[PDB]
Each structure stands twice: as structure tokens, then as C-alpha cells.
Design a protein around this ligand. Sequence first.
Ligand SMILES: Nc1ncnc2c1ncn2[C@@H]1O[C@H](CO)[C@@H](OP(=O)(O)OC[C@H]2O[C@@H](n3ccc(=O)[nH]c3=O)[C@H](O)[C@@H]2OP(=O)(O)O)[C@H]1O
Ligand SMILES: Nc1ncnc2c1ncn2[C@@H]1O[C@H](CO)[C@@H](OP(=O)(O)OC[C@H]2O[C@@H](n3ccc(=O)[nH]c3=O)[C@H](O)[C@@H]2OP(=O)(O)O)[C@H]1O
Lengths: 510, 510
Amino acid sequence: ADDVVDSSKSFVMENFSSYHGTKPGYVDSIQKGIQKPKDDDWEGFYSTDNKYDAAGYSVDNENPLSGKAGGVVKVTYPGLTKVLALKVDNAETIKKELGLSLTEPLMEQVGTEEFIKRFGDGASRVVLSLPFAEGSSSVKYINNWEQAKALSVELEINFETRGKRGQDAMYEYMAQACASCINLDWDVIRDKTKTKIESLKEQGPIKNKMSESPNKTVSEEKAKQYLEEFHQTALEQPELSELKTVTGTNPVFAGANYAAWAVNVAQVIDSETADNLEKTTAALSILPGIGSVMGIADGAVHHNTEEIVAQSIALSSLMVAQAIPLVGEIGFAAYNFVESIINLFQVVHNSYNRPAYSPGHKTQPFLHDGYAVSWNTVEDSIIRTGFQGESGHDIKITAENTPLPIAGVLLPTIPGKLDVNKSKTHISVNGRKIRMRCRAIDGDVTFCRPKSPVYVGNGVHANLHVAFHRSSSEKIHSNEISSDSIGVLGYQKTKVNSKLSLFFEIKSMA
Amino acid sequence: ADDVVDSSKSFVMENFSSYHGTKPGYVDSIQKGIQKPDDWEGFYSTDNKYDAAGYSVDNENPLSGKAGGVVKVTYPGLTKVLALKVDNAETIKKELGLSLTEPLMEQVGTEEFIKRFGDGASRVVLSLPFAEGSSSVKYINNWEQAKALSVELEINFETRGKRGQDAMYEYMAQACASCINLDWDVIRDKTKTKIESLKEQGPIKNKMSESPNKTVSEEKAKQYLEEFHQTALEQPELSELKTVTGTNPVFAGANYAAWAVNVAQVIDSETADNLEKTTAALSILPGIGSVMGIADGAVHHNTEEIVAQSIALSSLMVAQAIPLVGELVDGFAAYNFVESIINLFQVVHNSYNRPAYSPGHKTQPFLHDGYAVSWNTVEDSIIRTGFQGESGHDIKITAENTPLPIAGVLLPTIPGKLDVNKSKTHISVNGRKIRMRCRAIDGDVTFCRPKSPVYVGNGVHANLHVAFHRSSSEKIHSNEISSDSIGVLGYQKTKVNSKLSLFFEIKSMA
Ligand SMILES: Nc1ncnc2c1ncn2[C@@H]1O[C@H](CO)[C@@H](OP(=O)(O)OC[C@H]2O[C@@H](n3ccc(=O)[nH]c3=O)[C@H](O)[C@@H]2OP(=O)(O)O)[C@H]1O
Ligand SMILES: Nc1ncnc2c1ncn2[C@@H]1O[C@H](CO)[C@@H](OP(=O)(O)OC[C@H]2O[C@@H](n3ccc(=O)[nH]c3=O)[C@H](O)[C@@H]2OP(=O)(O)O)[C@H]1O
């Protein structure tokens, strides 16, 4: 029973409350009471501790990509409720270890007075708790359907009531989570986008460049060539002044990428598709290259003001309009295309609003120059402190195709307190153990280089094993250490090396 | 107790032997007996004589120096091999109760330890995994106890009388009896011959005199080196190479030229004169896969004749490149350059000979089209069989820079006894839970689409949780299942999707 219950995340509480995402049509009826609609082990009423994750369940089930969002309700049990947190979601296992019938549904047994007596610690009923999702700190709550009749149901937010376009109300709600926060007013962005489209189409050079279009089907090459010309003249108008400035250096935001995006849109959108928003979002949502239009690259949302986002969407919208004659299959460019891409913006912004480990942190890979490197486990990414002695840390390394070298690794040191254990530090290439020569560059950085050549690639990976020696029991101090990364050096290309960075955290023992 | 000892890999054995790599100069002296020139201070050996040979290279010229040999050492009588499940010395003595003050390996040589752990043997040898990615073990012997070791010769690489490190690598290649077992004597002789005869071909003399034969931009040098490559490829010395390098863009003339330019740009006169320094320099360059014929997880140039043609061609191109973008005796191109690149071939061939999980097997990432995907853990990549019920499987997903979509996932099914549990199968994007709509393609293939758009990229990752239900307890026979992979589909490019493959293993329970 211990092997399945996280007794440390379990607790009894009075007036236990949680949140339930509710779809259009039930935001009012569900407030009359939770009732079962007419694997069985997990049949029950689901809720979560996080009202923002609840809202993710609120979208029209017939149009989940683009349909209407209903609401979130807050449900509360009177009296005392036991939250029983489980370390597995395998019902056969749970019933075996909790001494239950292996034939009857798990969530049915959880509702019986015998289960409540044995596992309720005096509460009127038991609710099961499990991790909400990989990458989330929320929990999901599983309620037995009959016990859930005792819930009072109160409104938290009705997205319909807001009266806004698309899914704006839902995403604007979710962006509250982060008060590093994209919190855009999409009403402003819709109005400014409309305005800029209408007025760009009446700019001389644009009117000029428009008349110069083949206007009939051509080749992807002349299409792209003409649309890159159209992009420059458009970007020269003052409705796009700020965009021109922010898209000028980064090659992801180049006109050729706008043009490639426009061409790809024309090819996959037929007439049936354009006259259904759901169908249009399904089709746009699987194309590559949307980060050129979104202004997203290198781990950051660059286009993060209403004005710049509207300019970019305005620009894209016109380029789509001009590509459709060249490669199509016409008001779509300014109607559903704008509605659909707006929702895609909202999806991706929300992703970047959510707490998440960046590349090379914990077990998230660092992808660079054809290499992929990562900490082997989470514990490897932690340098413990406050003790005399040793630790070891494993980094996985490979590359995507041909053999790429590994020159060495840069390691942190603390003169007096933290040093490289030169005996146990080594690297292994498909099992071949390679010793390293480690030489201090100065008091804070040591460079270790393999004593024979290291190459990685498709079918060839390495495990870099870093060993640290602590000569005191003194806790390291943030002052004492500058870099927060281990630097693995790839190939050499003003000769510089490809730098692959693994980020660590200092922590005390536990 | 049992927390630090793996009994399943411990045993007593009579005449326990193991292997020790021995550096040049000590191959005869060490047969006189094991004598010593603190927790792990001890004599090291391994169960794999081929891994032993990887310790045999001159410690002061490790990249290009001579290889010494491998000896076999045997203990007369009974020896206890004690396999341990961790390698932190402080952790061993705690959980075993020894003295936290004397070195572990010292305590391992005492009668009280041998009495308590020897299970009747005259001494105890410690066993630990040899390295990540390796099946071999390393043995740690108490230095005093090791005086009892008999020491026989297994191989002396010097005695073989071969150039470079050929004797060491040809020994290592015996491990695989999908084996690269080249005769480098043949390759060296054919390379010298082809270099000489190519230099006397009329069109090559002709094209040579067309060189600017002076420092020029690298854009120019590359243009000329590309003309030279094509000319040289038309000569009968390279006819096979012309054929095997014609389609794959990795083996294109331009990459040979880029390579040749880079070589010329890093080799100075001192470097060119020293084989060790030339290998260090050459070993950190990108693009060596062009010359080696290594791409897509395979060594394509796998016959003596084609390797020598590729080495011969690159040699001539370096010779043409040096006057255009270097400053040394062209000289280098036919001598230390050839000697050095040969050693790099041997290193990489040896990596590809060693057993290794391919991309998308176990926890090795599958890298393709900007994405990176992997099984979260070894167990995730196993679909267990022989029982009724459920299992879960986590797949990690991200991309290198801009937001790239995940369109869906192809999953195996068996009409009878293996189904996709549609309510537990979901994808989580930086914690945001996204449910899936799963529809069958045929009786053996289910396709699941996310219900909100999924994008991944720098700073945005996803966890795909696949859940399988087994209705019968019958074990899954080989006929029943076609693919050995789960197919995650990326962006759409005759429309086709980017295919990211995660390979699984059907196994009975244990
Ligand atoms: N008076 C009412 N009483 C009870 N239910 C009502 C009522 N009115 C409407 N419902 C709906 O009935 C379903 C079950 O409670 C839910 O919608 P769903 O679209 O089928 O719910 C869709 C899925 O979302 C899950 N989910 C939904 C919201 C949430 O916050 N968390 C979560 O995990 C559900 O478990 C369900 O999973 P399964 O159907 O795969 O088991 C709920 O919104
Ligand atoms: N009569 C002799 N008796 C004992 N040793 C002798 C003798 N003559 C020469 N030696 C050499 O002395 C060293 C200690 O045994 C070894 O070489 P190394 O270059 O220092 O060996 C380099 C490292 O490789 C390790 N290693 C070597 C071979 C192997 O098969 N496995 C392995 O893990 C060694 O333990 C060593 O670790 P340390 O440098 O931390 O001691 C060994 O080859």
C-alpha cells in the first residue's frame, strides 16, 4: 500500500475545492450539480488544482482547434475530504497493493464506505490525485461519480459571456498565470491588422507592384521570386515601419521566408478548406516556417507588441493574397487565414508563457550545429555542495549525420574548494573509454581534452563523465562561481569552436 | 548490503584471468610480475582484451604514437569477483559497514574483508561496468594481492612491425569477425601508387598549370578546387570513386573542396612537420565524413580500393589548396597528411564496428528535419507482453530553433490483443495537456491527431504519452506486428510528412 500511495502528498482538508473545464452549452447546467452523463477503472469526474489547466478543457469538442471555449467552474465538497495521491496510474497495480477486488472497477471501489473507512482518515470521502501531466506541476483529481453529487458548483469564468472573437477570452485568461509574459490585447491586434491591410493595398508602390503580377499560375520559382519582390516594396511602406526594423538582421525573418510561407499556404488551401475555419487551422497548423511570421526564433518571441504582431500578420495576409493566383486551387487571405493564424499565434505564445526548462537544462537537449547534447539524468545536472569528496556527472553527446568531432570540455573550478578529479573524468564513444588530459586555463576554468579523437554522428554517441572533487565541506557561494554551464567544444570553424552548453545548478544535500 | 552489491554478476572462479593494456616499453617488463610504481588505488584490468588494447598507446603521443600490447593475468586458485552497483567509495563503506577512514581498496586486501566477502576464495577482485555503452567490465585488484598474478603475453603490437597504429586497430577489428576489417597495408600502398600516377595524368597536369598558384580568396580557391575535383574524378585511378560518390550530396566535389580549404588553413610549417600536431589539428575539423564516405549511419567507403581512392583524391586537393590559402611545403599533402587521416579513418571505423543503439532505439535520440525525439527511458521503449492490461510509454519531442508542428503519431495495433487506450494517450506541450483523436488506418496501424495544435522548438518541448491495452494474455508473436517503430509525424512538405521514428522491442515480463 505504501508502494502506491505518496503519503507525503496526501492530506485531509475541509471545503476541498478544485476546478473543472466546461464546454459551450454546460457552463450553466453544470452549476445545478455534477451528474454522470448517460477503461472503466478510471471512470469518474475529473478536476484539477489549476484553473488555467481546467480552461484547456473548455473548447468545443466538435471544433477543438478553433471552436468556442465554454468556461471553468469551481467545485467544493462540504466537510472533510481525503486527497489520496498515487505514485502510479496502473489500476491493476493499485488494486493489488491496496487489497481491493481485482475484478471490480477501481473508481467504483474508491466510492464505497469500506474504502473510505480504510483510506479516508476520517474524511467523508476520498478523491484520488495524480500528476496532471509531464512538464506540469499541477495535479488531476479523480472523483467517484456518486460522491461527486455532494459538490457545490460555482462559476469561475464564462468565456462566452466575454463576447470576444475566436478563442481570445480563453488565451487572455490563461496569460494571467504569468501576470517573460506575453500578455497581448488581441482586440487591438485584430483592429490594427484590418486597418493596415486596407491601407497597405492603397499604397502607390504596392498598387504598382500589384499590377506587375503575372496574376496567373506560374512556377514556385517565379512565384517566390515575385513574392520576395512584393515583400520588399511592402516592407518599405510606413504601415510596416517597425516591422522593417525588427526583421532586418535575423535570417529567420527574411522576405524569402515570408515568401516561402505564402507559397505553402496557397498550395494546401482549396475551396472547401478556406470556407471552414476548423479545416483551415488543421491545414495551416501542420506547415513549417510559421516562426518567420510569428517572429519566434532562438528561444524567444521577438514580435511581442500588438503593433508589430499586427504588422507581421498584415504583411503575411497580403503575401498570401498575391500567391494564390500564382499557385492557388480570394477573400480567404483576409478572412479565415487571419482568424486561423491568430489562433496559432495564441497557441505558441501560451507555450512560451508556461514554465519550461530551456535547452541544456535538466534533461532537455541542447541542439546546435548538428550536435545534440544533454545531461543523462536530472541529478547529473546538479552539483551538490556542503561535503568533502566526489561526485560524477554524465552528459550524452551525439550528432545528426556525418562524424563531427568533440575537441574537449570547459569545466568550472573553485580555487581551494572545487576541482576536477582528473583520474575519473573521461569520455566514452560507443563503449570505447577515452582518457582525458585536463589543464587549468586559470583558477576558475579547466579544459579537458580527450587523449584520442572523439567523433559522434548517426550511430555514434558518447558519454562524457565529469568528476568533481570537493576539498572542503564548505557550501559553495554564488559569488565563488561565474559560469553556470559546462562547455563542450565541437568542431572548429577568427577561429571559434561550436559551443554546446550544459547548464547546472548548485544545491545543498538532501 | 544488497544495496551496493550485484550478486547476479558476482561469482567465484578458479584461475580467474583478465586483460591489461600495456604501454610501449613495459610489454616485457610487466610479465615479470604486477608491481606498483586512495580509495581506488589499485591495479586495473578488464574482461575484454580488445578494450584492454585501448589502453596501450603511448601516453605522451596518444593521437599518433605507438601501441604497446595486451597481457593476460591469471590468479591461481579461487577468486571472488565482487560486482558493485555504484562507484562512490564513501557510499560503499557505509552501506557495507566497513571503516570510513581506510581506503576501500586497501580494506579489500585484508583477511577480514576476504573472509567476509570471498565466499571461500583466496582474494576478492572488484568488478564495475567498464563504461557507458559497453558490455565489458573493469576489475580493480588490491596491489599486494596482485603479486600473486601470473602474467602472460596476449599480443605485442610493435612486434607486428606495422605502420602507424594499424596493428592495434586491426586487432580491435577482430571483435566483429557489418564489420569493417580493412587491410591498411594494402590501402597505404594503393594510396601512394594512385597519388603518383594521378599527378602524371595529362588533364591533371593541365589543370594544375591553370592554378593561380598564389594566395587568393577562398571563394576563388573553392571554385578552382571544384574544377580540379571533377577533372581528377574523370581519371581511371578514381573510376569507382566517381561512381560511389555521384548521388549522395555528402560526397560531392564541393565538400571535398571545403575540406581541402579548411586543411590548408590550419596547417602551419611546425604543425605539418609533426604527426601528433597534424592529427590534433585535423581532428577538430568538420566535414571529414565527405572523405571517409560516412553518412546516414553507414560507412559507405568500405573496400580497400575505394578508401585509397578517396584518400588519394583528398591528398591531391590539399596539395592544390595550400598555395591558394596556406603557407607550407606542399610535401605535407602526401606524407603526414596521409598518415594522419589514416589514423582518423581507423578511429571512426572502430566506432562503427562497436555495438551501439541506433537513433531512436532505447534512449538514443532520433535527429531529423530540425526535430529531436527519444524514448524517455529504456523501459518506455519496451512493449511488454504476456498479460492482460495497460502500459504507458513516454516519448520526448522538441526542435532546434523555430516552432515546428507535430501533426500526429502512427501507432501499432494487433487486431486481436493490442489496442491504443484512447483516453490515456495524450501529448503535453510545456505542461499543457492536449488530448488526441485516434482513428484506425487498417487493422494494424492507428493514427492519433492532437486536438489543439502542437508546436515544438527552442524552449518548447512535448511529452507524448502512448497507452496500450492488451485484451488477452497471449504473448505477441512476430507475425502479428509489421513495423518495429512508432511513427511521429512532423510538418508536411505529392504531400508527405516528416517522419520521426522511435523503435520499440517486444519482450515478455521479467
Ligand atoms: N453536470 C455535469 N456533470 C458532470 N459532467 C458534465 C456536466 N455537464 C457537462 N459535463 C461534461 O461531461 C464530461 C464528464 O464530466 C465532461 O466533458 P467531456 O467533454 O466529455 O470531457 C472530455 C474529457 O476531458 C476530461 N476532463 C474534462 C474537464 C476537466 O477539467 N478535466 C478533465 O480531465 C474528462 O475526464 C473527459 O475524459 P474522457 O471522456 O476521455 O474520460 C464535462 O465537462
Ligand atoms: N609491472 C607492472 N605492474 C603494474 N603496472 C605496470 C607495470 N609496468 C607498467 N605498468 C603500467 O603502470 C600503470 C599502473 O598499472 C599502467 O599504465 P598507465 O599508463 O599509468 O595507465 C593509465 C590508466 O589506465 C588504467 N588502465 C590501464 C590498463 C587497463 O587495462 N585498464 C585500465 O583501467 C590504469 O589504471 C591507469 O589509471 P591511473 O593513471 O589513474 O593510475 C600500467 O600499464
